[PDB]
């Protein structure tokens, strides 16, 4: 059978990590304290999964687009997959460069099946730690293929909600993601790993704030899958 992506190419693939911590004063966006902890954790976690990791810090929206364009124009024929990690401010459908916003659609389109042929039929993973709006979760006590196929978006939070980051320990989502990848990459299919990430973020984290509006809030991550096969990081 062929229910799983071929992951035994000579290379696992690129892991591009865009780490935006400091923003242009004119944007009025706050510094993302704790994001370096996230970036270092993802670097180490994906290095051990045998990805070629490229860390990028504090990119403008222009730099983000050009980087994605360039990476998409690379020959990935010897690569099993592609991973892109986005750490920034955001809103619905949007990620922030240091000087202003970027359509998530614009970035991901570069990797469409018809636009990056050396990635066609291969899993393209986008991992996004950024807000998707301003809602807060109060909680409750207990032969052609489509050009959009083979994408997976691991969002940190539900549609329309804030996403939480701790200035000391890093973002809830990324710390949980890394720990689950470390413990389970040699054992579970990726969807099942991300379900455990969901549970850990949902159960183990709750906000502490002096501001009643922001206190005692919860978060649930959002897996969006257009994959056509099971994904195992091992072979």
């Amino acid at each position: 059978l062929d229910n799983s992506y071929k992951m035994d190419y000579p290379e696992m693939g690129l892991c591009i990590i865009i780490n935006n911590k400091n923003f242009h004063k004119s944007t009025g966006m706050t510094s993302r304290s704790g994001t370096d902890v996230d970036a270092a954790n993802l670097r180490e976690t994906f290095r051990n999964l045998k990805y070629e990791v490229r860390n990028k810090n504090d990119l403008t929206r222009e730099e983000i687009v050009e980087l994605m364009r360039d990476v998409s124009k690379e020959d990935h024929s010897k690569r099993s997959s592609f991973v892109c990690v986005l750490l920034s401010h955001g809103e619905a459908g949007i990620i922030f460069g240091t000087n202003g916003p970027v359509d998530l659609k614009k970035i991901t389109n570069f990797f469409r099946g018809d636009r990056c042929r050396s990635l066609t039929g291969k899993p393209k993973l986008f991992i996004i730690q950024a807000c998707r709006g301003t809602e807060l979760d109060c909680g409750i006590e207990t032969h052609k293929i489509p050009v959009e196929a083979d994408f997976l978006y691991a969002y940190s939070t539900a549609p329309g909600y804030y996403s939480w980051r701790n200035s000391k320990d890093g973002s809830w989502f990324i710390q949980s993601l890394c720990a689950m990848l470390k413990q389970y990459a040699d054992k579970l299919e990726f969807m099942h790993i991300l379900t455990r990430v969901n549970r850990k973020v949902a159960t183990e984290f709750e906000s502490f704030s002096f501001d009643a509006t922001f206190h005692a809030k919860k978060q649930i991550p959002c897996i969006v899958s257009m994959l056509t096969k099971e994904l195992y990081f091992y072979h």
Binding site: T30, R32, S33, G34, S88, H89, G90, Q129, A130, C131, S156, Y162, S163, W164, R165, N166, S167, S171, S207, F208, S209, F214
Partner: peptide
Amino acid sequence: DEVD
């Protein structure tokens, strides 16, 4: 804790 802070929001993104």
